[PDB]
Design an enzyme around this catalytic site. Structure first.
Site, PDB file in Angstrom:
ATOM      1  CG  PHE A   1      42.949  33.236  86.294  1.00  0.00           C
ATOM      2  CD1 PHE A   1      42.409  33.200  85.012  1.00  0.00           C
ATOM      3  CD2 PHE A   1      42.596  32.230  87.190  1.00  0.00           C
ATOM      4  CE1 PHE A   1      41.524  32.189  84.636  1.00  0.00           C
ATOM      5  CE2 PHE A   1      41.716  31.213  86.811  1.00  0.00           C
ATOM      6  CZ  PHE A   1      41.186  31.198  85.535  1.00  0.00           C
ATOM      7  NE  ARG A   2      48.999  34.516  86.340  1.00  0.00           N
ATOM      8  CZ  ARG A   2      48.378  33.553  85.659  1.00  0.00           C
ATOM      9  NH1 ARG A   2      47.500  33.860  84.711  1.00  0.00           N
ATOM     10  NH2 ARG A   2      48.636  32.279  85.915  1.00  0.00           N
TER      11      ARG A   2
ATOM     12  CG  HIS B   1      44.278  26.623  79.827  1.00  0.00           C
ATOM     13  ND1 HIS B   1      44.424  27.966  80.107  1.00  0.00           N
ATOM     14  CD2 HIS B   1      45.462  26.141  79.371  1.00  0.00           C
ATOM     15  CE1 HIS B   1      45.685  28.257  79.826  1.00  0.00           C
ATOM     16  NE2 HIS B   1      46.344  27.192  79.372  1.00  0.00           N
TER      17      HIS B   1
ATOM     18  CB  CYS C   1      34.026   9.167  75.692  1.00  0.00           C
ATOM     19  SG  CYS C   1      34.150   7.362  75.796  1.00  0.00           S
TER      20      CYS C   1
ATOM     21  CB  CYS D   1      31.374   3.863  73.142  1.00  0.00           C
ATOM     22  SG  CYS D   1      32.923   4.307  73.969  1.00  0.00           S
TER      23      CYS D   1
ATOM     24  N   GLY E   1      42.753  40.234  76.081  1.00  0.00           N
ATOM     25  CA  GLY E   1      42.528  39.937  77.500  1.00  0.00           C
ATOM     26  C   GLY E   1      43.346  38.808  78.115  1.00  0.00           C
TER      27      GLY E   1
ATOM     28  CG  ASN F   1      46.238  42.318  78.955  1.00  0.00           C
ATOM     29  OD1 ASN F   1      45.258  41.569  78.858  1.00  0.00           O
ATOM     30  ND2 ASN F   1      47.042  42.290  80.007  1.00  0.00           N
TER      31      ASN F   1
ATOM     32  CB  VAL G   1      38.921  43.234  75.026  1.00  0.00           C
ATOM     33  CG1 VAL G   1      40.399  42.898  75.149  1.00  0.00           C
ATOM     34  CG2 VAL G   1      38.112  42.635  76.164  1.00  0.00           C
TER      35      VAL G   1
HETATM   36  C1  A2N Z   1      43.074  27.455  85.507  1.00  0.00           C
HETATM   37  C2  A2N Z   1      43.991  27.194  84.298  1.00  0.00           C
HETATM   38  O1  A2N Z   1      44.183  26.051  83.898  1.00  0.00           O
HETATM   39  N1  A2N Z   1      44.558  28.256  83.725  1.00  0.00           N
HETATM   40  C3  A2N Z   1      44.375  29.649  84.159  1.00  0.00           C
HETATM   41  C4  A2N Z   1      44.112  30.534  82.938  1.00  0.00           C
HETATM   42  O2  A2N Z   1      43.414  29.825  81.907  1.00  0.00           O
HETATM   43  C5  A2N Z   1      45.524  30.833  82.477  1.00  0.00           C
HETATM   44  C6  A2N Z   1      45.523  31.966  81.450  1.00  0.00           C
HETATM   45  O3  A2N Z   1      45.613  33.257  82.056  1.00  0.00           O
HETATM   46  P1  A2N Z   1      44.829  34.517  81.407  1.00  0.00           P
HETATM   47  O4  A2N Z   1      43.749  34.084  80.509  1.00  0.00           O
HETATM   48  O5  A2N Z   1      45.942  35.403  80.669  1.00  0.00           O
HETATM   49  O6  A2N Z   1      44.261  35.334  82.681  1.00  0.00           O
HETATM   50  P2  A2N Z   1      45.026  36.592  83.355  1.00  0.00           P
HETATM   51  O7  A2N Z   1      46.505  36.130  83.676  1.00  0.00           O
HETATM   52  O8  A2N Z   1      44.277  37.123  84.508  1.00  0.00           O
HETATM   53  O9  A2N Z   1      45.137  37.661  82.194  1.00  0.00           O
HETATM   54  C7  A2N Z   1      43.984  38.413  81.867  1.00  0.00           C
HETATM   55  C8  A2N Z   1      44.388  39.806  81.423  1.00  0.00           C
HETATM   56  O10 A2N Z   1      43.181  40.432  80.986  1.00  0.00           O
HETATM   57  C9  A2N Z   1      43.322  41.822  81.298  1.00  0.00           C
HETATM   58  N2  A2N Z   1      41.953  42.353  81.252  1.00  0.00           N
HETATM   59  C10 A2N Z   1      40.972  42.136  82.132  1.00  0.00           C
HETATM   60  N3  A2N Z   1      39.849  42.712  81.694  1.00  0.00           N
HETATM   61  C11 A2N Z   1      40.119  43.293  80.529  1.00  0.00           C
HETATM   62  C12 A2N Z   1      39.373  44.048  79.628  1.00  0.00           C
HETATM   63  N4  A2N Z   1      38.093  44.310  79.860  1.00  0.00           N
HETATM   64  N5  A2N Z   1      39.977  44.510  78.517  1.00  0.00           N
HETATM   65  C13 A2N Z   1      41.264  44.267  78.279  1.00  0.00           C
HETATM   66  N6  A2N Z   1      42.001  43.555  79.125  1.00  0.00           N
HETATM   67  C14 A2N Z   1      41.454  43.056  80.248  1.00  0.00           C
HETATM   68  C15 A2N Z   1      43.944  41.831  82.679  1.00  0.00           C
HETATM   69  O11 A2N Z   1      44.681  43.030  82.826  1.00  0.00           O
HETATM   70  C16 A2N Z   1      44.883  40.614  82.632  1.00  0.00           C
HETATM   71  O12 A2N Z   1      46.236  41.010  82.384  1.00  0.00           O
HETATM   72  O13 A2N Z   1      46.179  31.167  83.710  1.00  0.00           O
HETATM   73  C17 A2N Z   1      45.738  30.159  84.667  1.00  0.00           C
HETATM   74  O14 A2N Z   1      45.626  30.733  85.974  1.00  0.00           O
HETATM   75 ZN    ZN Z   2      32.656   6.725  73.815  1.00  0.00          ZN
END
Ligand code: A2N
Ligand code: ZN
EC number: 2.3.1.-
Length: 277
Positions: free
Chosen positions: A52-53, A121, A129, A158, A195, A221, A239
């Site tokens: 995502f970021r 999430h 259900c 149900c 990650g 990370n 990772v």
């Molecule tokens: C829709 C919803 O309800 N929720 C979403 C998501 O579930 C929630 C959680 O965020 P996250 O799981 O930390 O993604 P990230 O912020 O992008 O963080 C991912 C981190 O992985 C790092 N990364 C990516 N590839 C990587 C790899 N191969 N090895 C190590 N780190 C890695 C990257 O630098 C980033 O900082 O943010 C919401 O938008």
């Molecule tokens: Zn049910």
């Protein structure tokens, strides 16, 4: 809501510093009684699912007026070396609980026991259900998002309305998953984040519950995280490379994935190599 800090520069540990950190991580795993892993979108990027970021993340590309790129569908996506390492870690009793922010459904599909997993999430393959709360793990992605009606009814009769488990920005975290994730994180003597940027609360704050009771915190990370200052060990690398080197130090092999399989309950721990002095 808020997208947070997007497209932050990536940090990479040199081969010498990286090797010493994985050995330090191996030492922490061997000495700890309750090991809890925290996974984010980054452990699925090696499978073709963008984060995502990250530099080319969903919200990062949106800010740049571009679209995120998927090198697979969620159904054709295969669990990474990290997903399969986590499966083995649990199997040998070296992993107590797994807390995940991922909706990709790769942890369940990898064969990881659902009773040792909290999907904060949701899961896009899992529909619930509205009447009896019975969950259905489907082979294909559930067509709706935001806890909306799918069209299918309960089969346990149900006959209750089946809704998706995907939480929108405004929706509250599932009570059972969050309570089990908080309990496991609080009682852990070691929490390892893989990650995840740790920017979304309360998910990002769960590995800190370990740090509050003298427990150790390890953050793996590429980009910097929200709670970098409170980590005992900070690993900057891919990772898959970190987990492959970890399994080698622990004397464990990464198991083969023979397609999507659902395991509801954890089995007693399998034999593991004796602990070093
Ligand atoms: C829709 C919803 O309800 N929720 C979403 C998501 O579930 C929630 C959680 O965020 P996250 O799981 O930390 O993604 P990230 O912020 O992008 O963080 C991912 C981190 O992985 C790092 N990364 C990516 N590839 C990587 C790899 N191969 N090895 C190590 N780190 C890695 C990257 O630098 C980033 O900082 O943010 C919401 O938008
Ligand atoms: Zn049910």
């Amino acid at each position: 809501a808020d997208k947070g800090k997007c497209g932050l520069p990536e940090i990479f540990d040199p081969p010498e510093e990286l090797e010493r950190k994985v050995w330090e991580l191996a030492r922490l795993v061997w000495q700890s009684s309750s090991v809890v892993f925290h996974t984010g979108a980054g452990i699925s990027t090696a499978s073709g699912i963008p984060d995502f970021r990250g530099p080319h993340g969903v919200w990062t590309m949106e800010e740049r007026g571009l679209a995120p790129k998927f090198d697979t569908t969620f159904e054709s996506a295969r669990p990474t070396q990290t997903h399969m390492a986590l499966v083995q870690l649990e199997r040998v009793g070296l992993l107590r609980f797994l807390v995940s922010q991922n909706v990709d459904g790769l942890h369940v599909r990898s064969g990881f026991p659902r009773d040792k997993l909290a999907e904060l999430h949701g899961n896009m393959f899992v529909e619930e259900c509205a009447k009896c709360k019975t969950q259905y793990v489907r082979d294909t992605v559930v067509g709706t998002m935001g806890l909306k009606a799918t069209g299918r009814l309960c089969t346990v009769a149900c006959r209750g309305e089946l809704r998706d488990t995907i939480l929108d920005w405004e929706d509250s975290l599932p009570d059972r998953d969050l309570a089990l994730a908080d309990e496991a994180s609080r009682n852990a003597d070691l929490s390892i984040t893989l990650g995840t940027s740790l920017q979304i609360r309360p998910s990002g704050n769960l590995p800190l519950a370990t740090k509050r009771r003298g427990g150790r915190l390890v953050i793996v990370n590429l980009q910097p995280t929200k709670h970098d200052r409170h980590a005992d060990l900070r690993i900057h690398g891919y990772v898959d490379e970190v987990m492959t080197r970890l399994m080698e130090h622990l004397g464990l092999e990464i198991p083969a994935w023979d397609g999507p399989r659902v395991l509801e309950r954890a089995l007693p721990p399998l034999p593991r190599p004796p602990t070093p002095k």
